[PDB]
Design a protein around this ligand. Structure first.
Ligand code: FES
Ligand code: FES
Ligand code: FES
Ligand code: FE
Ligand code: FE
Ligand code: FE
Lengths: 427, 427, 427
């Protein structure tokens, strides 16, 4: 280990909380499911930051509760059983909970037991908007009154912040919160810790990973060997109380210069061609790529922790569609252009890159022995701000799926060919 | 956690030994194989309470020894090798053991080695009766003279105990020990700890689990929302010396009342239709369902621990058949009625219920945080009596299969599509 | 455990280092790949003694470096990326290393970073000869000047040592180091620890394992129930500096008598038929079987540790072939005789024997509780010399594949049907 690395002892001590958050940052908003994944009266189970969650849509409204019966720990979502519009019951003995408050309102097989009403399961605030269902995954004792607005855990908004983050080279990127904003995309279970996936999301220099992508050649692009910071303020950190906590990278400005050659290897690029775009990231780990893949379109990504070694990788493209014609045009171009060539053709390569790093980090080795460099100012800055502003560090799961990794149930599923997942399989 | 739960600190302290019995209660009788699974000269390896056992039938008699060669720990059952009617040899170097005493009688490759006769492998008492082969799984040092009759670890017998446990609504259930008693059934490896499976076996209140079963609708049954104990003595605990240790539930008496409605959810059942039956459980964890599925027929179940997270679930139906005409009728009705509609159609639902509870309990959480209620007086009473009368708590396996859960051998098998099992694969 | 076993406390204390070497003996020469597995410009990743290694052939010469990028730990071999004839680059951010010295010569994405040249990856000496690519797997700090000749880690040579180890019943066995020596064979990943496999390699008494082999009956052989040492100098131990460290077993001499009967079991062999052969083993665990399967042909095996519970089992046959005709005869007889009837037909049985032993030993039980006998003077002698002359005990892997055994990555691969392996999958 060289003393010339960027991550010296002092620096590493500045992001200890981040090193400690393998299970994720709790008390934050996370995308749970696309709207189309939960129709009226549908019930679905998932897991975020190690917390088992079950959601149900009733009268058009989505509710979320901990997917764990108080009686004997059964997952309510495995066999959806609801007797009324305001409740959900456990399919084993009938412990029943109120969707709104999570209170144990009754027990099917024992309506007069003294336990009824004296406790209940945890509730998680929900915010559904433009095809996205967000859930505020919080600790059991996080007060309702303390729940912040969804916008605080979503990327910076434009043109609201165009003045703060000037972008003369491209039109304003829409937000999932914008009126008539349309979302198209997917989320796939990723194998490995969420942190490693997230940092890959906004890495500025990994051309080798995408050099062979079809889109790069179809568009006749000529990528740079890399991008390096020219000054200390190449990244702007935002920490105000009313707004998202993250960093904005001044791409396509003077603060970031493209590398066109490597004298040692005899490499040299000329006539660079490409796209104008800009990446930024905010807590709990949300990427925004302005002007990608095309003008007026934007890409957002999440790397939602499920357990400490699996995450749900979200990729969505957003575009405001005023008319019905606009929606059809966006849907069509997504289906035969963006989805195959970008969300897949471009980003699938990132998957192998992320998995390739996991072994160095899981047992803790990489978090100490990695040898970061000048370009790593990006991830380092992110780790520091994340350590300073996260609303909590999730505790390891206990008495839930993922608490123990080598159970006979997991071997049974693996023998059956089932990979680690996200959505709970129903009976 | 609510103070209104039935399992308060005082109560939990009364079943600490049961919380400690993950690997099972040792020094007890368990079903090993059906007679048809071991023909003359056949050898078969299994695992119970973490103890590897190999069985062989010679001259009609079955013998059981520890499936572990003293030399270098190879499982003798993997490649059945026997040179005489009274021995079994290890297929590697030929260490040979006496079927009766387990003594090392010779070594094929070294007939004059000083080790010969100075040691041997553990022997396990066998008691085969009416198609069932029971083995007394004991610790290496449990004295032969202390081995109790098989009856002591088998459910209460009738009419012998008809006076003690009156049953005016149905005829006496036969025992597998009875003359002309015929056994039909099966055993399947269950994924999860044995205790969780056993408790489900005699659970009185779980209609939601069997409400959709085909047999319930074919018979025009109308099940109750649940059964409630009306008095303190709703269960009779038997603790005599000469006999089985367990509890008899006074079903279909005024001590247990059905629940026909739930005012909170607006549920109500009318026109009560079903079957008369009674359940009881005795150590090491054997269920008896009198008058099921029909008169003169009885269902018995075992949840034999294999490791601490797998068990072998036995389901058998017994009926005394004097003539071979009776045997053909029973065999026929089993094949086209009891098996598909009951052992499978009814009980398969219990399998999903058991697996769903396992994650809450394996790491210890559930045994402390479960919130039991009034109806849980059944399992609690069983846990207490089991803690008081078990003949021993099995220790974790060491130097045997299951001792380590994530070996490269287990991953090889899993990769090949093989689920965790019970019967040792040969060659 | 009997006091009559050969491995008493005193004896066991003489091979504690061997008990401690689950991950293998490091700072030794091991077979890495066959020449045909690495063509010009081909890159391949492997793992030995827990050390990830990447090899590449440039201008006919093979180089070996640690398969771990020092930036963020990705395996360089997953996506072979080389810009010049003297380097290899990480496919993520372009950290580039010199094949010869392993020094970090540059970073494609940052040519002027201060980290450049201040560090690098470990290099491993390579010795390619007669179709075999050997690599000296060493600790990071093992000095270049201390790297010994490949011969020191290869079996004893003949006729060079014919006087020291007289062999009047057969002609001299060739070495892979001999001019015109031709190698034919294979290596397969084994599931279990390397020590267990190695000891089976030179075991003299396991007729039951090979009795049914086709070659035994096709050749009308009549094997002995076993072989016994008649004197305590039945094995010669060689320990001087200039040469291999190991032992020679005086097979087919007065020191090893065959066992033809077992009075206890009524076994008795007559007219024993077979062939003359001789086994010896040297560090790091290399078997030599002289005069097998035929005169002028010799079998060599290696049990290369990959992790502490997997190894790469090598089986090769060597014969000096002066002319092109000789090579065609050898290639032909290998393909339709040696490979199917010997390397497979005979040794495949050894695979099941090895796997069957692993469970007793992995958690440490067998290394203490195994009950060895007179014939075990063979493996005991090996354990002792190995403990005394090994050049190092490999440390468990940290931050590399195999460091953690139950990652979601491993469950993903297993779910997809992939068994634990050796050669790193590319892309
Ligand atoms: S486990 Fe849910 S009601 Fe019993
Ligand atoms: S391992 Fe059984 S005789 Fe050697
Ligand atoms: S991980 Fe190898 S250059 Fe970054
Ligand atoms: Fe990328
Ligand atoms: Fe049931
Ligand atoms: Fe062999």
């Amino acid at each position: 280990i060289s003393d010339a690395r960027a991550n010296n002892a002092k620096t590493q001590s500045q992001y200890q909380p981040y090193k400690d958050a393998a299970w994720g940052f709790i008390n934050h908003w996370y995308p749970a499911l696309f709207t189309h994944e939960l129709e009226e009266d549908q019930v679905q189970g998932i897991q975020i930051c190690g917390v088992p969650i079950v959601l149900r849509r009733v009268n058009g409204k989505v509710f979320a509760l901990k997917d764990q019966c108080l009686h004997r720990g059964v997952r309510l979502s495995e066999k959806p059983t609801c007797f009324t519009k305001s409740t959900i019951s456990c399919w084993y003995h009938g412990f029943t909970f109120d969707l709104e408050t999570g209170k144990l309102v009754t027990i099917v097989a024992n309506p007069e037991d003294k336990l009824i009403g004296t406790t209940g399961v945890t509730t998680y605030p929900v915010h559904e908007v433009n095809g996205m269902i967000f859930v505020f995954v919080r600790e059991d004792d996080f007060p309702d009154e303390d729940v912040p607005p969804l916008a605080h855990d979503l990327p910076f908004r434009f043109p609201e912040r165009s003045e703060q983050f000037p972008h003369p080279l491209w039109p304003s990127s829409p937000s999932v919160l914008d009126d008539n904003a349309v979302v198209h995309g997917m989320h796939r279970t990723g194998f490995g810790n969420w942190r490693i996936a997230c940092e890959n999301g906004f890495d500025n220099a990994h051309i080798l990973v995408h050099k062979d992508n079809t889109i790069v050649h179809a568009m006749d692009w000529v990528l740079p060997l890399g991008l390096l910071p020219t000054s200390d303020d190449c990244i702007a950190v935002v920490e105000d109380d009313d707004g998202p906590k993250g960093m904005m990278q001044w791409l396509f400005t003077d603060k970031w210069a493209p590398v066109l050659e490597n004298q040692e290897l005899g490499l040299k690029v000329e006539g660079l061609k490409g796209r104008h775009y800009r990446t930024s990231v905010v807590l709990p780990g949300v990427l925004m790529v302005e002007n990608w893949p095309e003008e007026h379109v934007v890409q957002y990504e999440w790397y939602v922790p499920i357990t400490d070694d699996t995450h749900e990788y979200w990729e969505i493209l957003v575009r405001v569609c005023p008319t019905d014609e606009d929606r059809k045009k966006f849907q069509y171009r997504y289906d035969h252009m963006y989805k195959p060539l970008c969300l897949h053709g471009f980003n699938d390569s990132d998957l192998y890159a992320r998995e390739a790093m996991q072994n160095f980090y899981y047992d803790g080795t990489g978090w100490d022995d990695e040898q970061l460099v000048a370009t790593d100012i990006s991830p380092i800055t992110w780790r520091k701000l994340a350590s300073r502003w996260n609303r909590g560090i999730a505790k390891p799961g206990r008495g839930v799926a993922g608490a123990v990794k080598d159970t006979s149930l997991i071997f049974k599923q693996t023998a059956d060919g089932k990979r680690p997942g996200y959505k709970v399989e129903q009976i």
